[PDB]
Amino acid sequence: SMATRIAILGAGPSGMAQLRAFQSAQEKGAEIPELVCFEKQADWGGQWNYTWRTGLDENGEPVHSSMYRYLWSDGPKECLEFADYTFDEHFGKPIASYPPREVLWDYIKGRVEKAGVRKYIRFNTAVRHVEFNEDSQTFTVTVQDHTTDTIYSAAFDYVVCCTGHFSTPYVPEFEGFEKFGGRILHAHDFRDALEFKDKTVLLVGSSYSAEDIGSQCYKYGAKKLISCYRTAPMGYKWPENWDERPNLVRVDTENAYFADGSSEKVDAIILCTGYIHHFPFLNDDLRLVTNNRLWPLNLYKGVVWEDNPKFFYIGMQDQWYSFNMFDAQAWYARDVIMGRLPLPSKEEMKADSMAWREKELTLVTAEEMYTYQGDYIQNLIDMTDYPSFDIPATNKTFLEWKHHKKENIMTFRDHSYRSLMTGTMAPKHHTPWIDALDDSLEAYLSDKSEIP
């Protein structure tokens, strides 16, 4: 019961971490501020809360999750496993290294359920506007409760933005899109790969989305796949029915034309072109503007807003590390809010951020990048009671996974790694990835193999 009141925006993994950071301080006998957390969806989990919905949701709010059917962990589970809450504790047994979305979801929910932080969240409530008043030094937050269809506002001493940056699509235009007769969609709207069975699918872009959405279409029966790249080819060894081309230049009624002078009939086009940082509830004095990168400017320690240090952002960096980074950020943000870590002058903040940015521009290899984020996280955890974990060993595990992708892009999900928390090696899954058609938690956790 501290005099202050805190608003957390979002109950995805970052917002969960911020609640769980406060709860942990309290469990250790400290006095915490009042917490309110606003979430526009009906349940928590952010990206992990899968929906069939597309575009706008039931209340007219933009659909948040970019996740599709059949999604599994893109990296080794070992690399995101929680320091305070372990896979063996949650599941009671060892499982393979690349669990499907439902299975990861269950695990991340288990940690917040055990913490009892659900009671701070208002669900089905969308944040409309946030304003800072110079007179009272307080934030006014306006939200819409879709359960009662009411709009109200409330006053807060600090605000922590945890609204994510993989939800609002970057969707470039190509010549002839208004004439093309097949479906055009962004990766954000992709749901079931079965919709593209026996079709030719063009994937525009050359990053994680293209890799994975491609692979799903392949696995579930697409006739043929083409992917095209703006600047450099992905360079993996694709299956027989998948080619990689230079950029799309235009499209016609039925066909796509490429910079190499090739052309062919295409059934559907999927833009795998990324996301923008979008904060519609924030005016300029509070609003972060950046491209997706390891070190956004204007965030002291990557979390405190330099123009108004009572506002914080969690998770706004590109994510090589995910969950552990959110915890380190969230722990750091509580300690500054609670007064345990006093902020330096604005000048010092800006000099610190510039050094981080300078170093970021140096980075060339994937290895250097994991290390950089690793060092970032380490610098945060050393400032709080958050427990150190083995970053160098995690980095090494990332490297193995990168190498496995190089070897065979379709089979990397069949490998196993050793837990950094428990030293235990992950078992082989009961069905190989290519044949594991069912993505349900029940099928994963059983022990019946699936038929080819």
Ligand X SMILES: Cc1cc2nc3c(=O)[nH]c(=O)nc-3n(C[C@H](O)[C@H](O)[C@H](O)COP(=O)(O)OP(=O)(O)OC[C@H]3O[C@@H](n4cnc5c(N)ncnc54)[C@H](O)[C@@H]3O)c2cc1C
| Binding region for a second copy (CB under 8 A) | 50-58, 60, 62-63, 128-129, 142, 144, 149-151, 168-169, 171-173, 177-178, 180-186, 188-189, 191-192, 194-195, 268, 276, 278, 280, 283-284, 287, 289
Q: Which partner in ligand X, a second copy, ligand NAP, none is near 39 (CB below 5 to 8 A by kind)?
A: ligand X
Shortest reach from residue 87's CB to ligand X, in Å = 14
Which whole-number Å values give the CA distances from 15 to 19, 45, 54, 158, 172, in the listed order?
6, 9, 23, 14, 30
Contact flags string 298-337 toward ligand X, x per CB under 6 A: -----------------x---x--x---------------
Per the CB < 8 A criterion, the answer to whether 17 and 330 are in contact is yes
By C-beta, is 231 or 253 nearer to ligand NAP? 231
Q: Which partner in ligand X, a second copy, ligand NAP, none is near 204 (CB below 5 to 8 A by kind)?
A: ligand NAP
Q: Going by DSSP bridges, is the β-strand pair 158-161/311-313 parallel, antiparallel, or unpaired?
A: parallel
Q: Which partner in ligand NAP, a second copy, ligand X, none is near 54 (CB below 5 to 8 A by kind)?
A: a second copy
C-alpha of 443 from chain center = 25
3-state secondary structure of 124: coil
Q: Which partner in ligand NAP, a second copy, ligand X, none is near 168 (CB below 5 to 8 A by kind)?
A: a second copy
Partner residues linked to 225 by β-bridges: 201, 242
C-alpha of 353 from chain center = 23
Examine residue 138 and tell whether it contacts ligand X (CB under 6 A): no
The C-alpha torsion from 228 through 193 and 51 to 234, rounded to 10°, is -30
Per the CB < 8 A criterion, the answer to whether 229 and 79 are in contact is no
Chain residues binding ligand NAP by CB under 6 A are: 74-75, 166, 172, 187, 204-209, 230-231, 247, 272-274, 292, 318-320
Q: Which partner in ligand NAP, a second copy, ligand X, none is near 320 (CB below 5 to 8 A by kind)?
A: ligand NAP
C-alpha of 367 from chain center = 20
Per the CB < 8 A criterion, the answer to whether 25 and 32 are in contact is yes
Shortest reach from residue 409's CB to ligand X, in Å = 16
Q: Which partner in ligand X, a second copy, ligand NAP, none is near 11 (CB below 5 to 8 A by kind)?
A: ligand X
Examine residue 11 and tell whether it contacts ligand X (CB under 6 A): yes
Q: Which partner in ligand NAP, ligand X, a second copy, none is near 292 (CB below 5 to 8 A by kind)?
A: ligand NAP
Examine residue 271 and tell whether it contacts ligand X (CB under 6 A): no
Here the tokens at position 268 are 């559907």
Q: Which partner in a second copy, ligand X, ligand NAP, none is near 107 (CB below 5 to 8 A by kind)?
A: none
What letter does residue 295 receive in the DSSP assignment?
A: -
Q: Which of 6, 7, 15, 184 is in the footprint of ligand X by CB under 6 A?
A: 15
By C-beta, is 311 or 313 nearer to ligand NAP? 313
By C-beta, is 53 or 406 nearer to a second copy? 53
Here the tokens at position 93 are 């047994």
Examine residue 248 and tell whether it contacts ligand X (CB under 6 A): no
Examine residue 163 and tell whether it contacts ligand X (CB under 6 A): yes
What letter does residue 206 receive in the DSSP assignment?
A: S
Sort 188 into a burial class: Cβ within 10 Å, 0-12 / 13-18 / 19+: buried
Q: In terms of Cα–Cα distance, which of 194, 165, 171, 409 is closest to 269?
A: 171
Q: In terms of Cα–Cα distance, which of 317, 353, 311 is closest to 336?
A: 311
